[PDB]
Amino acid sequence: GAMGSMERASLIQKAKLAEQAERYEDMAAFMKGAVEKGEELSCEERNLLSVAYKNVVGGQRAAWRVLSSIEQKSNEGPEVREYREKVETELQGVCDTVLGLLDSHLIKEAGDAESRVFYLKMKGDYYRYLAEVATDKKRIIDSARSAYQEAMDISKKEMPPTNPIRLGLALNFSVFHYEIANSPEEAISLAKTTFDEAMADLHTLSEDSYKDSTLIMQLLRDNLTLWT
Amino acid sequence: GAMGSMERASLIQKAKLAEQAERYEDMAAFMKGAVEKGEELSCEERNLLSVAYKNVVGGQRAAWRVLSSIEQKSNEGPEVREYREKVETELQGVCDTVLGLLDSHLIKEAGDAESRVFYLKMKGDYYRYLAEVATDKKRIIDSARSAYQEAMDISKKEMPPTNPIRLGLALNFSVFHYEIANSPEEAISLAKTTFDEAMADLHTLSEDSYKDSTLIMQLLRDNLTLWT
Amino acid sequence: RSLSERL
Amino acid sequence: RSLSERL
Numbered sequence: 001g002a003m004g005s006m007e008r009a010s011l012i013q014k015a016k017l018a019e020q021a022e023r024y025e026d027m028a029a030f031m032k033g034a035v036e037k038g039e040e041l042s043c044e045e046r047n048l049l050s051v052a053y054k055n056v057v058g059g060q061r062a063a064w065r066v067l068s069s070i071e072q073k074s075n076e077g078p079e080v081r082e083y084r085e086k087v088e089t090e091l092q093g094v095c096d097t098v099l100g101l102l103d104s105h106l107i108k109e110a111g112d113a114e115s116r117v118f119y120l121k122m123k124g125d126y127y128r129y130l131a132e133v134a135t136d137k138k139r140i141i142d143s144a145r146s147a148y149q150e151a152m153d154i155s156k157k158e159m160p161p162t163n164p165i166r167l168g169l170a171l172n173f174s175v176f177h178y179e180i181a182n183s184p185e186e187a188i189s190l191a192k193t194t195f196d197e198a199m200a201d202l203h204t205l206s207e208d209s210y211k212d213s214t215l216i217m218q219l220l221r222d223n224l225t226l227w228t
Numbered sequence: 229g230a231m232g233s234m235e236r237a238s239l240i241q242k243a244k245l246a247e248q249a250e251r252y253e254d255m256a257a258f259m260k261g262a263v264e265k266g267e268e269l270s271c272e273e274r275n276l277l278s279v280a281y282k283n284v285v286g287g288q289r290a291a292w293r294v295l296s297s298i299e300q301k302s303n304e305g306p307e308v309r310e311y312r313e314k315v316e317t318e319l320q321g322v323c324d325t326v327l328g329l330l331d332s333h334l335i336k337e338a339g340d341a342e343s344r345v346f347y348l349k350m351k352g353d354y355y356r357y358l359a360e361v362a363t364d365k366k367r368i369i370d371s372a373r374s375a376y377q378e379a380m381d382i383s384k385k386e387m388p389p390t391n392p393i394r395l396g397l398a399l400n401f402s403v404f405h406y407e408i409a410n411s412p413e414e415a416i417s418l419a420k421t422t423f424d425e426a427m428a429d430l431h432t433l434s435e436d437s438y439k440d441s442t443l444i445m446q447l448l449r450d451n452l453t454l455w456t
Numbered sequence: 457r458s459l460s461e462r463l
Numbered sequence: 464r465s466l467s468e469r470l
């Protein structure tokens with residue numbers, strides 16, 4: 001690893017600075033270095049990892065989207081395809097790096113539901129990003145589905161319906177159903193059941209937990225509004 | 229150069245795609261490659277060069293700003309200084325690359341006022357960016373001032389007061405006076421004289437030129453509002 | 457496009 | 464901070 005020279009704690013500290021500076025590539029490299037130290041991640045540290053790579057891959061997806069749309073209009077010189085391929089190859093590289101970190105060795109060492117569901121959701125997310133770009137695509141979709149399903153089974157056994165990780169997992173799994181798996185009815189059914197079960201569990205939450213959970217439930221409702 | 233393999237025209241085409249995709253690092257590398265072909269740049273091509281590097285350096289300045297402020301609060305571990313230094317070193321590298329392109333060999337081949345004033349303004353801008361970060365600083369400031377002054381003398385002889393390059397040059401030169409050279413009165417006097425002379429020349433412009441010029445004159449007025 | 461879990 | 468020439 002490139003960050004083998006820096007203390008674990010200094011990598012985490014600099015990751016938070018990079019976030020403040022909105023330098024998400026630096027942030028990702030710092031958190032990649034922290035992971036490669038070999039110790040498990042705290043809840044805070046896991047979210048720093050996710051925030052960093054989600055911003056990096058997010059800019060890549062947005063760019064791939066623009067170029068792919070330009071490419072498809074020109075099909076209704078080689079430059080548009082070439083550069084779209086470059087961004088695409090770059091996006092796949094970031095996804096493979098994240099999946100590499102999860103496979104070596106964050107997932108196998110994650111024993112608590114909070115950490116294991118988080119990493120398996122993340123694994124589903126980044127196979128979903130690869131899927132958005134693939135054509136191979138069937139196998140990537142199955143890998144995404146498998147990771148999401150494993151995470152769902154654990155969250156249903158081990159987490160209350162208003163747990164933000166469980167809600168975010170269900171939200172993203174329903175996006176997978178709707179956008180990737182051509183299962184819009186499965187997407188709608190999962191969003192409804194997720195929303196309703198969380199609603200019934202809100203009475204157990206504190207003021208702050210209530211805010212955290214309802215914020216994510218609103219995304220479920222927004223999608224249902226767009227989907228129906 | 230890294231782009232020695234690609235056609236000049238393909239570099240320009242991909243620069244415009246990178247702009248649409250908001251991939252300004254790619255855009256800068258593409259335009260750097262186009263410059264290194266050795267041919268002079270068209271008006272459009274010059275603005276692509278400026279847009280690309282201005283976005284790259286802009287993100288660096290914004291990040292350096294955040295970290296430097298964090299650093300100074302911690303002075304009223306080495307991590308904050310180290311990472312601020314990394315971003316700073318990275319910012320100086322981009323400025324040196326641009327100044328390198330201007331010195332090899334865009335400026336010496338720029339004969340028209342439109343191109344020569346543009347490159348000399350650009351040279352002043354990127355010495356100003358180095359100045360924001362320097363402490364060496366006196367020499368960098370003088371280099372910025374010298375480039376700006378040379379550009380001003382040519383624009384006054386060769387351009388009408390409403391020329392957008394002349395207005396943008398005067399605007400940025402006044403920012404230099406106010407923010408770098410501790411000459412707030414010189415900044416104010418230049419903004420007033422620039423605004424007034426352009427006002428008198430608007431009657432010569434078309435509808436579209438009128439819009440382009442007044443848009444930049446508003447920035448002069450905004451600064452004067454903040455400065456007085 | 458469908459809305460994802462936010463950060 | 465003072466306003467620069469925009470793109």
Ligand SMILES: COc1ccc(C(=O)NCCN)c2cc(C(=N)N)sc12
Nearest residue numbers: 016019042043044047048051164463
């Ligand atoms: C819901 O996700 C989070 C949970 C907790 C924290 C956090 O500060 N924990 C302190 C020790 N437990 C955090 C920080 C983030 C950031 N820097 N963007 S996300 C995020």
Ligand SMILES: COc1ccc(C(=O)NCCN)c2cc(C(=N)N)sc12
Nearest residue numbers: 244247270271272275276279392470
């Ligand atoms: C004022 O600066 C400009 C002038 C002209 C053009 C342009 O299209 N010229 C076409 C041939 N003359 C342009 C394109 C930009 C861009 N891609 N962001 S800036 C910019």
Ligand SMILES: [Ca+2]
Nearest residue numbers: 001002004036
């Ligand atoms: Ca390694």
Ligand SMILES: [Ca+2]
Nearest residue numbers: 184185186188
């Ligand atoms: Ca139906």
Ligand SMILES: [Ca+2]
Nearest residue numbers: 229230232264
């Ligand atoms: Ca070279």
Ligand SMILES: [Ca+2]
Nearest residue numbers: 412413414416
């Ligand atoms: Ca005075």
Ligand SMILES: [Cl-]
Nearest residue numbers: 001002004036
């Ligand atoms: Cl290694």
Ligand SMILES: [Cl-]
Nearest residue numbers: 001002003032
């Ligand atoms: Cl590495």
Ligand SMILES: [Cl-]
Nearest residue numbers: 001002003036
């Ligand atoms: Cl390695």
Ligand SMILES: [Cl-]
Nearest residue numbers: 229230232264
């Ligand atoms: Cl070379």
Ligand SMILES: [Cl-]
Nearest residue numbers: 229230231260
């Ligand atoms: Cl090179």
Ligand SMILES: [Cl-]
Nearest residue numbers: 229230231264
């Ligand atoms: Cl070189």
Ligand SMILES: [Mg+2]
Nearest residue numbers: 006007008009
């Ligand atoms: Mg150590």
Ligand SMILES: [Mg+2]
Nearest residue numbers: 234235236237
């Ligand atoms: Mg050629």
